[PDB]
Structure 1
Amino acid sequence: TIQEARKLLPVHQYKDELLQEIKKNQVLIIMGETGSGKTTQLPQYLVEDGFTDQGKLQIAITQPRRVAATSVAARVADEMNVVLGKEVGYQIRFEDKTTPNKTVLKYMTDGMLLREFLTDSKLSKYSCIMIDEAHERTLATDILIGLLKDILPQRPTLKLLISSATMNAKKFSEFFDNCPIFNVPGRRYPVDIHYTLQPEANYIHAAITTIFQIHTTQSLPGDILVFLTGQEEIERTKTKLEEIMSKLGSRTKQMIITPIYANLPQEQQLKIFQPTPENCRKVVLATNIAETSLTIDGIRYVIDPGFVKENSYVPSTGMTQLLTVPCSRASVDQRAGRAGRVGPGKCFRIFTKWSYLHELELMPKPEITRTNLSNTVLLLLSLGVTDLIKFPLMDKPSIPTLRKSLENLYILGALNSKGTITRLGKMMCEFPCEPEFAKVLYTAATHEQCQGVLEECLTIVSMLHETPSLFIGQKRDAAASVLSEVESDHILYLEIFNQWRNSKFSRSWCQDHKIQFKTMLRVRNIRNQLFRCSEKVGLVEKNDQARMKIGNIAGYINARITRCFISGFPMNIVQLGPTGYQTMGRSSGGLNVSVHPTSILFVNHKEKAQRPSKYVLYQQLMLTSKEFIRDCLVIPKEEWLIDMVPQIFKDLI
């Protein structure tokens, strides 16, 4: 059952030894491996012991990812014998599946407890707070241990718990004034680690061939796990492992392919939890270790090419390009240790043994050293943190990274010239999004040349949160079905949601125009969150009045929206140089960026004979073969560029 396979987890032998120590200490550090019974069973012991005091106080468990917050909360809701959300909830950025008077245990992310400091400074709803995966060193975790350190002398009733690996757990003890380290080891079974003989020409073709020689030439029971970089690599792998499986037929053995990534339907997430039938081999595809953890945990094989896609800070502008890097030697050893949970597993590594020892970093760097920090500093200045150097967090950001996040909040007008947090800066804290998405919604309701288009800018901003999951097939086939001639990628996203709204949110509409219906229900939910937050601020009333003054005509609306994204993203403006599109700014010369072929602006150069635009506004930069602009926006006039943010473009233009 599920009530007896929980006893075989390594934390049940350490049950009463650990409940006695949390009653003694205020902060305690639990040390071990990823998913060794803790964060699934240990929050269940705290509820039954009575640390919540009859549901008056809550318990927050802080997962680092969006995917690991929901899946682990659903897995505990099976064990608790509660439905979900009533007694065991979760809190994503845009999803709050809790009820306020019954939720006792809740599994949120790192950004959503960090946002909880606004409405409550001392975190008075919570009696126990557990930070999970503190060795990952995400930015919203590295700040959240600094802010909880400042409120430890003021509330002694709070109890803090930190889960980390067996390598970083001493540095967290040095940080919390010689904190006691409790140790929960796992059943370490030996894993036989294999390396290839040559540098591989492709890590996907070698990873598909590796699954087949494990499937054919090895016996059951053993389930396969593959670590892939992104969701575009997983679904390219899942379909191609479905094509070659079809030619085999019923000859070999059953293969259940079970991917783990974000924005997934419930019929695929129930395939995570239920065990395999006999004469069946589950092949799990995922990206990080913390989501692959299972209670039954029948997996015994791991394939790793050793790559993580992560947001590297751009040296020219203030933003973070998405870049794919070799992962660290400590992170590879977390992946090989996934096979040795129940039995003696095997680990297949696409890189050679030489590149393991002499080309990988021995320990992964923290995220806080190479990031935007624009949402960070505006968050700390709103909480009363005046000094940013003397703030006592453990790894501190560099000064060129920190001065760029100050002068980007000054171009947005979120910081005063005297350094105080302005009313626009107090407004950007209210919206559950990036502070540059909050400038676009402010410009669309209040600006003297741009008011009237908040209803069209709550649509396009909601479409940009769910860009890669919108459509089935290619986008150049789906774009011609909704509107025959679009020029920029933002107006196309305005046209898709309006026509879907005009068809009364039809399931049959999205299948005709090659659009995923499950994505558009989330975009419709993000829009309901961003519109409800614009009512409390007052940008709704300021645009209902600005629309009754001027009833705008559709020839001007696409020019209002273009200006509303210049004022929110002024550094993401790219000029057509003599060699190509080139990043335009006062810091560095340029990056010689090209357009991603998924964007609709690449289609208008090949399919159409239109000349290339002079100014293009992107939402996201990425580097695979060269730098690629995604989510384009065409700016045909220099006059729209100076008249919105003149503090940059007066000297440049």
Structure 2
Amino acid sequence: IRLGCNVSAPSGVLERVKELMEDYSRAPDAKFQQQFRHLLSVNFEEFVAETKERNADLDWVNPKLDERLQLELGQRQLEENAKKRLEARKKLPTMKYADDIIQAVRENQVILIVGSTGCGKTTQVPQILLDDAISRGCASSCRIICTQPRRISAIAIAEWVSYERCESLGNSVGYQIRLESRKARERASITYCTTGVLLQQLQSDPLMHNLSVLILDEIHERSVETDLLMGLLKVILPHRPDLKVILMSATVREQDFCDYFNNCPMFRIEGVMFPVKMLYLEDVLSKTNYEFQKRMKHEAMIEPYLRRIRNSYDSRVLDKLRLPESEGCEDIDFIADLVYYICENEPEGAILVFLPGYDKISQLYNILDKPKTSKGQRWRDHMAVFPLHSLMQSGEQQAVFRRPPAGQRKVIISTIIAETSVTIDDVVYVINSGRTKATNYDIETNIQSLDEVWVTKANTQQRRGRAGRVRPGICYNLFSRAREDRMDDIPTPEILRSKLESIILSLKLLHIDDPYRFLQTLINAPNPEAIKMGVELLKRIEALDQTGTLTPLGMHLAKLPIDPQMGKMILMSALFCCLDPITSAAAALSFKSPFYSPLGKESRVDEIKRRMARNMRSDHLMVHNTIIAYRDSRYSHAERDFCYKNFLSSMTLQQLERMKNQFSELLYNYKFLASSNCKDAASNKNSEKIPLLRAIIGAGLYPNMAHLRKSRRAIHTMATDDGRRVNFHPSSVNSGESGFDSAYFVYFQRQKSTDLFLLDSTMVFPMALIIFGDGVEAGVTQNTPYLCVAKTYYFKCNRETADVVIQLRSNLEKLLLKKALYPAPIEENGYEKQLIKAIELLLSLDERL
């Protein structure tokens, strides 16, 4: 072993820490504790038993309301601002099935509706179920929940359905998403929510007694949430004979779902869509006959196909198809050329280019903006070009959705983001390169990767769909039909790629204590070894004992709507009075960063960040400083001018702030704070003590450590605690920096792309790791006295410190156990604070001078 720096502490510091610790050791409530032991002490049937009493509002109906609504439905359908849309709504395909759906719901607990774009299932099915109940004089027994994957969907659909009923939002229709609602009346109502909303409500209503019809939408996307929720319905439905579930799906492996609920009824409702012709690589080449400019397999693949098509393509269009580079988006000039070909032949209408990511979007944009080509600068000032990317701003504007200045043709360069999430309406032409990026997880290298791959059949049929919303259009797929037959049906179901810590933990609140056995029953079962890794992580942060059973701290973490590691971070920040900065770090990790990356300004966004970082060498503290600066700009009425000069999204910034306030109100209700204000003075008296902040951050992100080793932009020799070589991601504020006060870092996500990168990081000090971590041992290996952490990092430490530190840990552990089991704010002049002050004092030794 090789020893790191000395962490020994001054005598007079040690002694005061010893006075403080013994002040803590001298001292001589519990509604939470009783809920905790109650959860552990009941079986499943008692659990089901008791959640039914406590949730029985729908057993009560209001007959005078049933009859009045029923009267006003019969009468509103004779008025006329209410049969335009009855005629209009009845020209949607779903309405042809109205009676048949009603009948199918009546006869079955679970039906499946399979539809496609335009079919109207999402807007009409809940209105058919509702109106059926009002008409039959059953209004008040009817509460309908329709889940969506996305926040924006939930809103727009609710508004539209509400508009179709000539009601303001809040009446028969509403929506609910994280921290924003327009709730509908309790009974005779339809509510559109994100799936995760419902899944959090399960904790209070684990058997869904508080709704009559559940409509799961868009399940074919195989999000973790709908996958989880279909798996839970298999537990819930046997004890809820009268609950109705309608599954709804696009035409993307529909039979899987049908098969999953024994073999339930299935409707196929058609979409409303213009014809779109599908040209493949051989056909695009055959019309542009562009030529290309300076592993096989690739003609092992391409040549049996090339024969079956000897007769029907030109001489050697068969050419380029032998070129590996002809497919995908290797050659951006090919693509730019196809943009030009569409610009002069084929009538007007926007072009939508699908490229795998930021880099290629950038190349193609520059090639149009400053062109080499003869047929480039003719067209330059007759194209309205927008790049479209999650990290770019143009999406959340409006200039991209409205049609172009006349004489100009709109061109959209985009990631997969325009497949479902973002919709442009004058698109007539789609160039589908067939290339995208996806995250992947190797289960026993622990490397998460970001890889360019071929799209799926599912992605292509959707992309094609995007061409035909306003008029017959065309989808150009820059790969060959031989490529397509190698392509997969659908993406990998995200639950097969995800970490399961929060899922395993949250199942405990639903009285599902065996994660292996429940998870195994999903449409696609996760690798059991991933589950194991999940459990060990929760065992390590002590959310579970080593039986696998919930700890008092684990219950608190389960109840916070954030990943457990960052929950632990937030609770700790309540104890050590640093709520505001840490909840910022927490919120930004959980959601995303408020910075754009607008094309070409990479260099000066880099410079904004480094300035916001204030030399604190922390991506996480940089976001907090950003929020501090944001708050002031608002106080100064300079909000827009601030967000503009600093490449920041004001709407990410506000959402970050609603999240922090959510964590502060929750922490108050759980009795960790005396105030629900995230900015409260008492809650924040240590929020400027940067070494302390680093410690609590480290407390959350532990055990993700990394250690930098050499000098020398600047080049780095850094390796995570597992031994693997990493570098700071260049988007991170620590990339290329030199002269850190410490060689140690914590990180939330590591990700392999061009290299194995730490996506985010905070410089931490050895003593902070040692106090809050584990694997702490005091020994002598050379003839030096050491003190270690995680049995991985060994620091020189005299033994008078090793002993105070080890005692400090023993006290820190006892205190944390007791705050979890009997939550109360830490009294400012009580015995517990003494121990807090003890820890603060040791950590202050590493203040930057």
TM normalised by structure 2 equals 0.65
- Tell me the C-alpha RMSD between the 2 structures: 4.0
Say if 1:318 and 1:404, in contact at 8 Å, map to a contact too.
no
- Cα distance in 1 for partners of 2:88, 2:380 equals 32
Say if 1:92 and 1:109, in contact at 8 Å, map to a contact too.
yes
Larger helix share, 1 or 2: 2
2:594 is the counterpart of 1:469:
yes
Q: 1:525 aligns with which of 658, 675, 679?
A: 658
Distance apart, 1:427 and its partner CA = 1.2
Q: 2:491 aligns with which of 345, 355, 364?
A: 364
Deviates further, 243-252 or 557-566: 243-252
Q: 2:255 aligns with which of 170, 183, 203?
A: 170
- In the alignment, what sits opposite 1:453? 578
Say if 2:664 and 2:676, in contact at 8 Å, map to a contact too.
no
Distance apart, 1:47 and its partner CA = 2.8
- In the alignment, what sits opposite 1:565? 697
Say if 2:105 and 2:111, in contact at 8 Å, map to a contact too.
yes
The superposition leaves residues 3-25 of structure 1 with CA deviations (integer Å, 9 ceiling, x where unpaired) of 76655433233333323322222
- In the alignment, what sits opposite 1:124? 209
- In the alignment, what sits opposite 1:186? 271
- Cα distance in 1 for partners of 2:249, 2:494 equals 16
Distance apart, 1:384 and its partner CA = 0.8
5 Å-filtered alignment, 1:509-548, equals 509-541=642-674
Q: Provide the aligned length of Structure 1 versus Structure 2.
A: 631
5 Å-filtered alignment, 1:248-267, equals 252=382, 255=384
SS in 2 for 1:28: strand
5 Å-filtered alignment, 1:547-558, equals 552=686, 554=688, 557-558=689-690
Matching residue's letter, 1:621: R
Distance apart, 1:580 and its partner CA = 2.8
2:728 is the counterpart of 1:645:
no
- Cα distance in 2 for partners of 1:210, 1:2 equals 42
Say if 1:229 and 1:287, in contact at 8 Å, map to a contact too.
no
Alpha-carbon distance change, 167 to 458 in structure 1, aligned in 2, over 3 angstroms: closer
2:718 is the counterpart of 1:593:
no
SS in 1 for 2:175: strand
5 Å-filtered alignment, 1:163-562, equals 163-166=248-251, 168-186=253-271, 189=275, 191-195=277-281, 197=320, 198-200=326-328, 202=330, 207-220=335-348, 222-228=349-355, 252=382, 255=384, 268=397, 285=414, 287=417, 289-291=419-421, 299-313=427-441, 315=443, 322-340=450-468, 344-358=472-486, 360-391=487-518, 392-446=521-575, 451-465=576-590, 467-470=592-595, 473=601, 474-479=604-609, 482=612, 484-506=614-636, 507=639, 508-541=641-674, 552=686, 554=688, 557-562=689-694
- Cα distance in 2 for partners of 1:411, 1:237 equals 47
Alpha-carbon distance change, 570 to 14 in structure 1, aligned in 2, over 3 angstroms: same
Distance apart, 1:536 and its partner CA = 1.1
Say if 1:304 and 1:349, in contact at 8 Å, map to a contact too.
yes
- Cα distance in 1 for partners of 2:396, 2:488 equals 39
Matching residue's letter, 2:535: L
Q: In structure 1, list runs of 5 or more residues that go unmatched.
A: none
Say if 1:619 and 1:632, in contact at 8 Å, map to a contact too.
yes
- Cα distance in 1 for partners of 2:369, 2:470 equals 28
Say if 1:29 and 1:182, in contact at 8 Å, map to a contact too.
yes
The superposition leaves residues 142-164 of structure 1 with CA deviations (integer Å, 9 ceiling, x where unpaired) of 11001112221222332111122
2:713 is the counterpart of 1:584:
no
- In the alignment, what sits opposite 2:112? 29
- Cα distance in 1 for partners of 2:369, 2:197 equals 37
- Cα distance in 2 for partners of 1:320, 1:374 equals 16
SS in 2 for 1:153: helix
Matching residue's letter, 2:629: Q
Say if 1:90 and 1:107, in contact at 8 Å, map to a contact too.
yes
2:761 is the counterpart of 1:632:
yes
Q: In structure 2, list runs of 5 or more residues that go unmatched.
A: 1-83, 286-319, 321-325, 711-715, 777-788, 794-849
- Cα distance in 2 for partners of 1:278, 1:9 equals 33
TM normalised by structure 1 equals 0.83
**Which one scores higher on RCO, CA 8 angstroms, separation ≥ 6?**
2
- In the alignment, what sits opposite 2:98? 15
Tell which structure's C-alpha radius of gyration is larger: 2
Say if 1:32 and 1:184, in contact at 8 Å, map to a contact too.
yes
SS in 2 for 1:113: helix
The superposition leaves residues 30-85 of structure 1 with CA deviations (integer Å, 9 ceiling, x where unpaired) of 12335532213322322332379546643222223445444444544554444446
Say if 1:375 and 1:434, in contact at 8 Å, map to a contact too.
yes
- Cα distance in 2 for partners of 1:151, 1:105 equals 21
The percentage of aligned residue pairs carrying the same residue is 28
Distance apart, 1:481 and its partner CA = 5.0
- Cα distance in 2 for partners of 1:7, 1:227 equals 35
Say if 1:452 and 1:543, in contact at 8 Å, map to a contact too.
no
